Subunit: 317 residues, 3 copies
Amino acid sequence: AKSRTIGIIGAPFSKGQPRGGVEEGPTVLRKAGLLEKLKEQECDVKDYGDLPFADIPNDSPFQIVKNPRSVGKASEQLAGKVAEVKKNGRISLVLGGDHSLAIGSISGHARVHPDLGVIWVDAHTDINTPLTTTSGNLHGQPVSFLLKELKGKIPDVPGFSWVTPCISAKDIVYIGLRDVDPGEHYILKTLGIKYFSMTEVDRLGIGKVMEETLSYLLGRKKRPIHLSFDVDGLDPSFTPATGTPVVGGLTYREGLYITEEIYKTGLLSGLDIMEVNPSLGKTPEEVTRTVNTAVAITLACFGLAREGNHKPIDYLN
Amino acid sequence: AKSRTIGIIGAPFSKGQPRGGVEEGPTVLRKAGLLEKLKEQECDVKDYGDLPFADIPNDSPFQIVKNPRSVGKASEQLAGKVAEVKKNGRISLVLGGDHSLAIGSISGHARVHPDLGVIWVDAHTDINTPLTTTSGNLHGQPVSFLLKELKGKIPDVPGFSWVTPCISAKDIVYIGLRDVDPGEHYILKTLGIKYFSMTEVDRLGIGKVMEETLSYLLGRKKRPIHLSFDVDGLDPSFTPATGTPVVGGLTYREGLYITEEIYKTGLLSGLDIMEVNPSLGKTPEEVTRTVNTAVAITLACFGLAREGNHKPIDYLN
Amino acid sequence: AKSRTIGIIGAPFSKGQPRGGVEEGPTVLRKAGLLEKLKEQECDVKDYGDLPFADIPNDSPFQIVKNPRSVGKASEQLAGKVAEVKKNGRISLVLGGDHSLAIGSISGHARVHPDLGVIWVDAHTDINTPLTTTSGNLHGQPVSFLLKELKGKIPDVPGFSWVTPCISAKDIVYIGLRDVDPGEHYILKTLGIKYFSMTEVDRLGIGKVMEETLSYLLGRKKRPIHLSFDVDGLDPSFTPATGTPVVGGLTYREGLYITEEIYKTGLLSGLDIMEVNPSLGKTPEEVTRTVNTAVAITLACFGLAREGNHKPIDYLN
Ligand SMILES: N[C@@]1(C(=O)O)C[C@]2(CCCN2)C[C@@H]1CCC[B-](O)(O)O
Ligand SMILES: N[C@@]1(C(=O)O)C[C@]2(CCCN2)C[C@@H]1CCC[B-](O)(O)O
Ligand SMILES: N[C@@]1(C(=O)O)C[C@]2(CCCN2)C[C@@H]1CCC[B-](O)(O)O
Ligand SMILES: [Mn+2]
Ligand SMILES: [Mn+2]
Ligand SMILES: [Mn+2]
Ligand SMILES: [Mn+2]
Ligand SMILES: [Mn+2]
Ligand SMILES: [Mn+2]
């Protein structure tokens, strides 16, 4: 089945943020048996291996923006790989790595399917421009480079001349927001992007949120869905091993409900599992817990339903 | 009050599954002072004691099904006792013990009240047949023996010839499902059984789940209700000392909500508190936490309300 | 802005309950940086300091009621200070201290705003009279001293002659109840007080809870809102360092949603943050967690929102 045909890309990249270890995410996710688990779920899985992100020594800051050439080239090379997987008729599964990789993942996906819609599960908007950013960390800026309405607000950052904005503000839905910068909130409200912060999830419940999200994106016509899952979107009681955790997050159940509903459209076309950092656990158990939650979210994107699953055979004979 | 008139039955049995300690469930529920708290809630409590389960020598397996004569006899004896409690105009309250005992608890209850409706709160469907099971543990098979629609699909298993299917596929509602086998999922679909998996609970909220459950069972007219409560239906964050824990379960709140709602109909007629295993706690507090929750669940079935409770007197004098 | 103009009053009082340490509540809330966080949030903050509560020796009990003269005096002192802050046109922010201080906090606030509506966030109703109490602890009795309907059911308690009931049964809404005494349950129902116990929060979701609360209080016309927050309204997993914790409480998210919805009315006029006991944390981490949660709650009352916030300027320039 189309919704269960997968091309796994390993993106071991960390220079979009300051904390070492996030590049180990593709290794830890594989070691937890992700590939084997997806095949037990009737998936056709092709593992495209881990992208080599050859060292870019001499990568001085652009103003306050850190490692711009490394971040730009990693995303540029990932875009090429995602385009190749999409051309092979497979759902691209990007194992991160930090969230700056979404620049390349979404650009590469939009090359084959320009009509795609984006569902962004995260505690943060990641919509800072290189000029509104106060941290200078590119993992909090991927969306700004991707939105068409922000063209003229993105300065000429070394390593990003290949970037052409591919998503319009009306083609993205945020879910799980709870730590937004002032500049980011200004962008969000001015561009009129559809969002469901933890306030909306509390108000409406996850059922109504997904109902509104899928109607908002697919109501006019059926189009490919790109899900970008930052593991910090869930509460740190489920994914503690991550760079920028924020309390009061989406529950484990809620994370599975979003992925269960997205799978059911049959239109998932690209998936990012980002920000798993196996060296940010306070104990060896916080690491396994983060990785198992990430694996569980992934399996639900490819058909695993809590109600159960069965093959078209007579189980009573 | 009929809704507060109880017949206590201890069922210290574990051979429906391979993990030792669940036979100690009645003792630890009793030690926590369940009977005293119920009497303190204005309940008429009669204690029928803990049933003696004689060891069956040479209890050879039926195919891969383990301890068939023991599970069969334990349920046969429990059926007789539940029928005796019901005939005395009391609500039977079975303290388990593994979930295989539900065969006898529900059969016994259907002998006095054949128009009963079953609410099954669990992470599991326990609807495997002796042939669909892959584990061979009978606690994952009680619903198959009880269902009228499965007559002809259950072979002659030693110890079960006394069983006559007493409930139809339309007289049972599941709440909490999140770990269902393919064959169980097939049965669920082909027999059109009403169920609220954790997916439906996330979608609708426990308020709507309970509205629909009671409307489904009581819609036509009032009829007796049997609640079979497996503690693993709740999240292992609340009930960890259990044999088959599954993450992302019902909350402590949702569990009380379900039981407070069933109490309010005044139609509770049979109750099972199952799968409490006090040898399966990682810490002594994990055991007390499980037992405290199971006691809190039982107290709400018999009137204890979070908004409060009071005697029909004038407290301002 | 008026909704951001604050008058801070520290109330280091503990004699309303038997557990030492709650008098250290205003200090640990200050040491966390509450005032500084409010100032950074564009809040006009004025520190009125901590009230000097003079030790009353030979404070003999009134029947069973412990420290009557000390509790009455402290609330009498707080009433004059809250009334002063209100006449200065600032929102009174009382840093508790045990919940008996609500006597003084609400009374002083009604002296300047007699048409005020109360939102009481608590696991408990705190509506016992000096005659219905079984503990004799005055922190579980403040609502009885304040209701006009209970005038004649409150005996002459030494230190409380200054009290004059300032609210009617229809001017108060409870949210989060789950441990109500029989005497209190009788009072709650006979007076027909509006309440949302955890059962209604589970049934409706916090979104409908806030919809109904605000509609009931502000329906007829706009009126000042007094929020008295007992940190034990939230589950012990978010606020463990407290004297009377009850399991199955409001989540961190619900706590934030209540306080965000209250800010949005622009009618917040009084705020009590009560029962933070830094000496009751099982570990130093349990203390910090409670204090951090209490700070998060307070900031949301004055405009800090999870979707983000921004100043009225063009951030894209
Ligand atoms: N908006 C921030 C930024 O640096 O631009 C500011 C920040 C630092 C303190 C407050 N939150 C992290 C966030 C970046 C998140 C990236 B990610 O984890 O979602 O991928
Ligand atoms: N379907 C199972 C079986 O053994 O038949 C397979 C199982 C083991 C691995 C997956 N779940 C346990 C379950 C049984 C639960 C019984 B009870 O705890 O809910 O009462
Ligand atoms: N109803 C009680 C009372 O003492 O009047 C009985 C009590 C003692 C054990 C059961 N709950 C505490 C509660 C008081 C709460 C005060 B507060 O924390 O909400 O402010
Ligand atoms: Mn992100
Ligand atoms: Mn993030
Ligand atoms: Mn079971
Ligand atoms: Mn179970
Ligand atoms: Mn209180
Ligand atoms: Mn309280």
